[PDB]
Symmetry: C15
């Protein structure tokens, strides 16, 4: 067991990296997906192209939150200090 | 049984990870699902394609919050410090 | 029976988990449901398709706040520390 | 009878759980219901279908705040610590 | 006459439960009632339908704040601690 | 005369219950009333129906702020602690 | 003649009750009155009906702020504690 | 002549009462006045009806900030405590 | 000459009264005036009627900030305490 | 050279009066001038009218910030306390 | 050299007067200028009138920030206290 | 194992770099991808062009957050101080 | 070589003056330049007039931030106190 | 190796520089790129011209965040103080 | 080598200067660039005029953040105090 300023800061930090880090990407994925299904309603023949482009986009955005995830995980499972 | 700065920080961190972590994805899911059912009303024949793309989208967004859940669960059931 | 920093933090944390965890999902659910009933007004024949997709959607959003609920419940009934 | 940091925290937490927990669902219920009554005016024949889907939606949103309520209730009537 | 941390926290908690707990429902009620009244102007013949769906909706929203009011009332007239 | 943490917290609490508690309902009543008079301009023959529905709505919203009022008044005229 | 925590809190509480208490209702009154004069321009024959409904609305909104006034006046002229 | 916590709080309170008390009403007055002059451009013949209703409105909004002014004035010229 | 907590508070209060007190009225005056000059362009024959109604409006909004000014002036030139 | 709580509060107060006091009027002036210039483009013949009403409006708004400037200048060159 | 509460407050105050004081006027100048060039695109023959009116407007808005500037400069080059 | 002010500041810093650093890019990516997918629906033939411009854009935005990630990674695996 | 409250305040003040001071003018410049290039697309013949007016506007806005720069530079290179 | 107030500050500063520094540019890059791909769909023949102008824009915005990056880098690799 | 309040403040200040200094300009650049590429889609023949005006614009906005950069650089490489 260990408790000090740095272990305390690490668990808070871990929460903030993934917590805050999902805000922009979460909204952004919704905006993109929303336009995707709207576009499919408009032009069902473009479904494949639309899906392909969305998927790509979803990946970029999800990688943003994943950066927060790796920081969180480094802090919890590979902490350099504590 | 155990109380210090780091246990106190862990329980707060746990709540913040899942609480904050649900904000962007919750809004994003509503936006996407909203455009999806609008699109279905507009072009009921496209419902399978729209549902497929939405479902894909919903999963990517839910995953953002699940990262938060994971951090919360590690802090609660596999805490590295306390 | 027991009071320290960690019991105090735990009860605050439990409330922030569910309380904050309902903001994005509640707003999202409203956005999606509203587009659903609007969609039904526009095309009452698509009512079954619209309803099925809405329901799917509402479940994904409900799960986001449930993650908060779960963290709140372990904190209250299976606290790892106090 | 008893006052310490946890009883004080428990009462504030209970309030935060239900108070904050009503913000998203309250806005969302209004957005849905306004769209529902707009739909009815637009297509009074779909009223039953609209009302049915709205009811389903409202219950989902109400459940979100109910999660807050139960945390508040546990804190006040089944408090694990104090 | 007793004053301690918990009695002070309790009166504050009481105000926060009902004060904050009215923001979402109050806004939501406005939105819904506004759409309803506009709907009546558009289609006076659907007034009974519109008015019924509104009433149902208002009640769901008022319940959200009432949960706050229950917490306030427990904290004031059935306080578990003080 | 009496001054302690709890009398101080009570007068602040009283102010916050009615102060904050008027924000949502005040905006909401404006939104609803605004659509009402707009609807009357559009369809002056629906004036009675519109007024009836508004009035009902205004009552629900005003009851939300009134909950804050009763808490304030319990705190000032029927305080359980001080 | 008299200064302590509770007198200081009372004077602040008084200002906050009326100051905050005017925000939602002030905005709401502007919104409603604005739609009212727009409606009059649109249908000058409906001016009596529009004025009647507005006046009713203005009263309900003013009452929200008056609750704030009342709390302020009790704190200043009928203080229960100091 | 006299300085303590309560004189200090009283002057701050007086300023917050009028200062904050002008935000909602000032914005509201602008919204209503702007719709009024727009209305007059659309239907100059309704100018008298529009003006009368505006004036009524402006008075209700002005009264909201006046409540703030009144609390400020008693605090300055009829302080109950200091 | 004199410095204590109340002189310090008085100067800050005076600034807050006029500074905060200009925000709503400043925005509102702009909203009204922009609508006024838009109306004039639309119907230059109504200019006198528009200008007249605008003037009335502007004075009402200016009075709101003037209430702040007078509190500031009392605090600086007729201070009851210091 | 004197430094005390009040001299420090005074220089800060001075900045807040004119700094905060420019937000509403600055935004408002922009809104009004933008509408004016757009109006001129729409109806170049009404330029004299539009320009006169604008000038009048600008002066009312600049006065709001000037009140802030008066407070600043008193606090700096005619300080009542220090 | 001199360092005390008041020199420290003066340099911060100076920054806040011009820093905050550019926010409203900066936005407002953009809004106005934007409508000006839009109006010129619409009616290039009105270019002279539009420019004349913009210029006037820009001056009023720029004077608002200049008030913050003179306070800053009084504080740095003509400080009444330090 | 070392804990000091700097190790604590470093883990927090790491979370802030990637957490905050994802807000703008995440929102921006959503906006861009949404427009792209809508564009494809409008003109399926331009899909290759649209998709290429999007990909280029996504990369510029992901780099913004990656800068945050670099700072986080230095702070964690190549800390200059601790 | 020199450290005290006022040197620390000066360096912070310097950053805040230019940092905050760029917010309104940066947004305003984007708004104006945006309408300018839209206007050019709309009426390419007006490009000289639009460019002239924009350039004038850009200068006035840049000047707002430069006031911030000036305060920062005085604090850094001509500090009156330290 | 070394921990003091400046090393702690340096690491937080580095994070704030790149984290905050990505917010505006990230939003702006998204706004530009979305408009770019919308333009391409509208006029696929202009793609090269659109892509060229977008590239120029993206580099300008990226440079803004790069300024943050370099401050962060100096703080971490060329720190003048620690 | 050296740590005190002023080195600490200086590094924080340097980061706030560039970090905050990029928000308005980054958003502004996005607004202008987006209107530019939209303009090019509408009128590809005006591409050169549009690009030239955009470029001019981007430079004015870039300079705003550069002022921040400059304050950051003197603070780091030509600190007047430490
Ligand atoms: O000054 C050095 C000493 O500091 C420690 O105690 C200090 C230390 O600042 C910290 O535990 C405590 O402050 C803790 C408040 C910070 C809470 C949280 C931390 C990270 C996430 C954000 C905020 O205060 C103690 C007393 O002032 C420990 O007593 C000891 O290990 C160490 O040597
Ligand atoms: O490192 C854990 C230590 O916790 C205590 O000291 C702690 C103490 O908990 C706390 O009141 C104090 O800071 C109290 C502030 C708590 C702020 C909050 C708590 C978690 C959520 C975010 C931050 O710091 C002390 C450092 O000396 C006790 O001395 C002991 O239980 C244990 O040694
Ligand atoms: O730090 C854990 C310790 O908790 C207790 O001490 C605590 C004490 O309860 C508390 O007043 C003190 O901090 C008091 C402020 C706590 C505010 C907190 C913030 C997060 C949300 C809940 C409210 O810190 C002490 C640290 O020694 C007990 O002394 C002991 O059982 C235990 O070791
Ligand atoms: O006055 C008698 C009572 O005093 C104690 O409470 C103390 C407590 O220890 C202390 O931290 C507290 O100072 C803490 C001030 C906390 C302010 C808080 C902020 C929002 C929620 C409510 C108000 O003062 C209390 C005064 O009542 C005990 O709680 C109690 O055992 C005892 O009966
Ligand atoms: O610790 C218990 C004792 O606490 C009291 O003094 C304490 C007590 O926290 C409070 O008066 C004071 O803090 C008062 C700050 C809270 C202001 C306000 C209160 C409600 C509304 C929101 C915030 O500090 C005293 C000294 O730290 C009293 O001295 C005594 O009656 C009591 O026994
Ligand atoms: O309970 C009232 C008591 O007030 C004083 O103690 C008070 C004192 O006023 C105050 O500086 C301290 O807290 C000071 C913080 C004031 C915060 C603010 C004030 C009202 C507006 C909201 C909250 O707490 C002390 C508790 O010991 C004096 O000891 C005495 O006048 C009186 O016994
Ligand atoms: O609590 C009331 C008492 O007020 C004075 O003491 C005061 C003292 O002025 C003040 O520095 C201290 O608090 C100092 C901080 C006050 C900040 C306040 C917050 C609200 C807005 C105005 C500024 O508390 C003391 C409490 O003992 C006098 O000692 C006495 O006349 C009186 O009994
Ligand atoms: O330096 C000499 C002077 O010192 C005293 O002021 C003291 C005061 O008591 C103390 O609370 C104060 O610390 C309080 C710090 C308050 C910061 C405040 C926040 C915003 C508004 C302005 C700045 O330090 C002052 C230093 O001047 C007295 O006010 C005065 O009688 C005396 O002439
Ligand atoms: O109480 C009076 C004495 O106050 C001074 O020290 C006090 C004084 O409040 C101030 O320097 C320091 O607080 C400084 C914090 C305020 C930072 C900043 C100031 C203006 C801009 C906004 C906030 O604390 C010292 C110790 O508490 C000096 O020691 C002395 O010159 C003076 O006589
Ligand atoms: O525990 C051992 C170390 O303790 C010291 O750090 C002390 C430091 O002096 C003290 O101000 C500090 O209390 C300050 C609490 C600051 C909270 C801060 C807020 C956001 C960024 C991170 C967390 O406690 C530290 C505990 O590590 C020294 O930094 C270091 O020399 C030493 O090795
Ligand atoms: O007046 C300058 C004095 O600075 C120190 O005292 C200062 C000390 O710097 C500081 O920690 C304390 O306040 C520390 C708070 C710093 C807040 C922040 C700093 C600048 C940016 C805005 C405000 O006040 C002390 C007053 O006694 C030292 O005693 C000495 O270097 C010098 O006499
Ligand atoms: O005030 C300047 C003095 O700085 C040092 O003392 C400093 C000390 O570093 C610091 O912990 C203390 O304040 C500690 C809190 C500083 C927070 C600060 C806020 C702005 C952004 C950066 C972080 O104040 C002391 C004042 O005596 C040294 O003692 C000395 O070299 C120098 O005279
Ligand atoms: O790094 C990138 N972001 C992620 C997008 C989804 C796949 C994983 C990488 N892409 C580019 C950003 C610019 C530099 C790296 C390449
Ligand atoms: O990792 C990703 N996010 C999850 C979304 C839900 C399905 C599981 C993966 N997507 C991509 C982003 C990073 C690059 C490749 C993976
Ligand atoms: O359980 C859920 N929420 C309840 C709200 C009240 C109506 C019934 C559902 N939703 C989903 C979360 C778990 C996955 C499926 C269910
Ligand atoms: O886990 C998910 N969310 C729940 C929503 C309600 C249905 C049950 C699953 N979906 C996917 C997100 C990540 C990929 C796998 C699971
Ligand atoms: O319980 C609910 N909320 C109240 C609204 C007003 C009428 C009474 C019920 N809704 C549902 C929550 C989930 C399923 C049960 C009912
Ligand atoms: O409680 C309600 N709110 C108020 C509306 C206006 C009249 C007074 C009651 N209504 C319903 C909410 C759900 C449960 C109670 C009934
Ligand atoms: O109490 C109400 N509010 C006031 C509005 C202005 C006229 C006086 C009453 N209305 C209703 C809400 C609570 C249920 C019945 C009363
Ligand atoms: O007195 C009011 N405000 C004044 C502003 C300057 C022009 C004259 C009116 N309005 C109302 C508040 C009290 C009720 C009627 C008057
Ligand atoms: O009190 C009210 N507000 C004032 C506005 C200006 C005219 C005078 C009254 N109106 C009503 C609100 C509550 C019901 C009775 C009074
Ligand atoms: O005094 C007012 N404001 C100033 C605006 C610029 C011209 C000078 C007057 N307006 C009115 C406040 C209420 C009635 C008096 C005048
Ligand atoms: O003071 C004013 N503001 C500035 C506008 C640009 C030229 C310099 C003055 N104008 C009027 C405001 C009302 C009182 C003074 C005249
Ligand atoms: O001083 C002004 N602002 C600057 C804008 C950029 C060119 C230089 C002047 N304009 C006017 C406002 C104050 C009254 C006259 C001057
Ligand atoms: O360096 C830049 N940003 C990265 C975006 C992703 C591709 C790699 C470069 N842009 C420009 C900044 C200013 C000029 C240099 C390039
Ligand atoms: O230098 C500037 N920013 C650079 C961003 C990357 C592309 C090249 C320009 N803009 C202006 C600021 C100084 C005035 C002209 C240049
Ligand atoms: O200083 C200015 N801003 C820079 C933007 C990029 C081109 C170089 C100048 N423009 C004017 C603002 C104040 C009037 C003179 C200078």
């Amino acid at each position: 067991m260990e408790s000090n300023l740095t272990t305390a800061a690490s668990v808070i930090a871990a929460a903030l990296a993934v917590g805050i880090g999902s805000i922009g990407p979460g909204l952004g994925q919704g905006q993109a997906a929303g336009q995707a299904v709207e576009g499919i309603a408009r032009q069902p023949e473009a479904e494949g192209k639309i899906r392909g482009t969305l998927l790509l986009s979803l990946a970029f955005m999800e990688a943003l939150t994943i950066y927060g995830l790796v920081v969180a995980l480094v802090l919890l499972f590979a902490n350099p200090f504590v």
